[PDB]
Amino acid sequence: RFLKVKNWETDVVLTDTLHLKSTLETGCTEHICMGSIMLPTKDQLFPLAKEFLDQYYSSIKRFGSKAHMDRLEEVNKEIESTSTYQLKDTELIYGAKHAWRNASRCVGRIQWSKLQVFDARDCTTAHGMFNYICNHVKYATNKGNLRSAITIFPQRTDGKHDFRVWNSQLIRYAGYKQPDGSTLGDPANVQFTEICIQQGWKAPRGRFDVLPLLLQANGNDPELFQIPPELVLEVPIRHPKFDWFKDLGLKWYGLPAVSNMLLEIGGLEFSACPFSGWYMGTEIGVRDYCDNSRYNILEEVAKKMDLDMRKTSSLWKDQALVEINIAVLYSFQSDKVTIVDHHSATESFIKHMENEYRCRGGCPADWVWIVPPMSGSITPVFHQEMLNYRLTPSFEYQPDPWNTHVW
């Protein structure tokens, strides 16, 4: 019931007690592990509110205080009366920071306590959402010196007045299915792009067209907005050695900003809560550029390097992979846009894990997501046993709004 995690490189053993507080379910059973699966009322609400307020008041060293009991009292009254309740600013900030702290798939959690929280609960229309999002983007981007941020729109009431950002990220590139049968742009975004087109977006059918925001306020139909081009910081990708690399015409945006997740705090659900940090290099260079179902540029790069692509055993893919990732890091650094390499990021995470075990009794982590998509075993996280479990406050997946939306 007390669990040990071992690092097989350093032999350091940590003891986890935090998992006992866990409450949501994993998908795993005693007979089957689903560790590699990507997506495995008033009476319901008060114990959730209670659980949360208890941890909040414990965190500020005021557990069992009158202010604690009083707050629990007031929230109780408000749920009985109004069927929901409103978080104090302090609770909202604590909860958002802890949702990130609890994100078992996130390798960048050493930064968790330095999150800028923008309270957008006063927002009522899609134009207001656009304004808050532009401000978030400008704040977070900070001319290349990225700062973590989350913007939190009004919580779910009856599920019929949902605030939703329809985009999966604030900034992404369009994808178009061609008559040539190939894909132009980002293949990941074909369906969403068509939805943008059905709703009136005039697409410029290019390879790197920044998608417009599709914003839904108060359960109303979603409206389109273009993010001011001057607020989307992008980086042309060049290589420090290969002068031909620039000719590939590659670029990427500086700000990774997830906008389709649900933030749960004290049983309250924030269905629109875009959040952003800064990239780890492999996200762009390995996944975005080299995934077969993404930009898939391995072959083109390999050819320009004049590698032997006859046999897999020449490891031409691996060679081209490293160089593409070299170019990404070099390009961001050269343009002074915050980025972290997978070595630095994973080393940071090991330190964070040890900090969390020491000061919290554990750290939920999903090894399948934490180990980077290249060079896994030369990073310290590969050798690190991790326990995965779900704590609240949490970021959760939610269904795409177009499958949900009653137009």
Place this chain on the structure above:
Amino acid sequence: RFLKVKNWETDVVLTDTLHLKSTLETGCTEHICMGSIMLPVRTKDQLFPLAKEFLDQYYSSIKRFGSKAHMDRLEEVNKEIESTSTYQLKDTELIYGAKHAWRNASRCVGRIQWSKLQVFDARDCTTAHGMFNYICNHVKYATNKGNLRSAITIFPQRTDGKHDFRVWNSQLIRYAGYKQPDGSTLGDPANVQFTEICIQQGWKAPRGRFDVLPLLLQANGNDPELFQIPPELVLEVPIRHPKFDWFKDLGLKWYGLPAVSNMLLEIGGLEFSACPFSGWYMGTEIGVRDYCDNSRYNILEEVAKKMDLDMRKTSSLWKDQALVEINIAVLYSFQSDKVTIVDHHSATESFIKHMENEYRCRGGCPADWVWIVPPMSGSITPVFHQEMLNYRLTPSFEYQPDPWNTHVWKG
């Protein structure tokens, strides 16, 4: 019940029904996943249903389920269990059992080959000298002058737990590791403890960087005995690089035969504590883990220097760059010496086809993603994008404690 696994690269969805036949525990609960945890005397009572479950599987597999032959065999095993408290497998059942333990090994990416396994029945073995002879024959057969052949040799099963056969080596072929008084290590740091045991048992160590360890063999619960594998039977490959000529002067080599000797084979409730098995290497086992783990030979630095990479900041990806070149060299060297080896691209592509085939013909393929995905270039192999379900089927290979921690010394 049905479980679906999706491939996120191809959107191919597979349906698992085989997990219903799962018996053993995973370590996970509905509250916690232990998927990344490395390591998460039997009564007649528990033994007959385990025997019966196995014999039902065997007889189904040969299309003789419910036959008089099946029924007679159940009766025979039942009577042998009540008479003698255990039972003996027929050779046919042993072979089926060993092949299925491999087929069921969720951590093994090489399972496309499972039906081609040479099984050596060593259940008539009684002494450590006999074990040595069987193991030499296995090594020679499996090596086949570099045209590697998968094999397993099966020594007598556990009886009371006081007469175990055990190979004390973790693998049949491994290099010694010696801790120096200055804290540095000569040879393979993985093998320092075992090397010290061998030395204490009387092994005269050459104390070099690549000394093949002697076999330490325990028969019938007796104290283990030291044997040196005939050097002419140990195929080794000097490592060189196709473009870089200085690579050879690193002085690296490795042996050709990966042969795990510390696991326990469970078939029909019977426990084979000594069952060395061998296949051929996937390049990254040597080039990534053996050479580049900080806790093994750890050569990334020396290599990186010789390539004149920028080692001042990790952001240059010098480690990744050197890692690739080392793995090129390993594959190049084995191929040039005509020693069987498979690259991680080939191996994972084959595994995907095997897995898809298993879903169709068997209703599933238990697989441990954490172990299946190679230790370099993960997401440019197809297994990275493949959802997998991990569960435990029998017959199976299991971990067992290291013999030096449990052995009762006779002196």
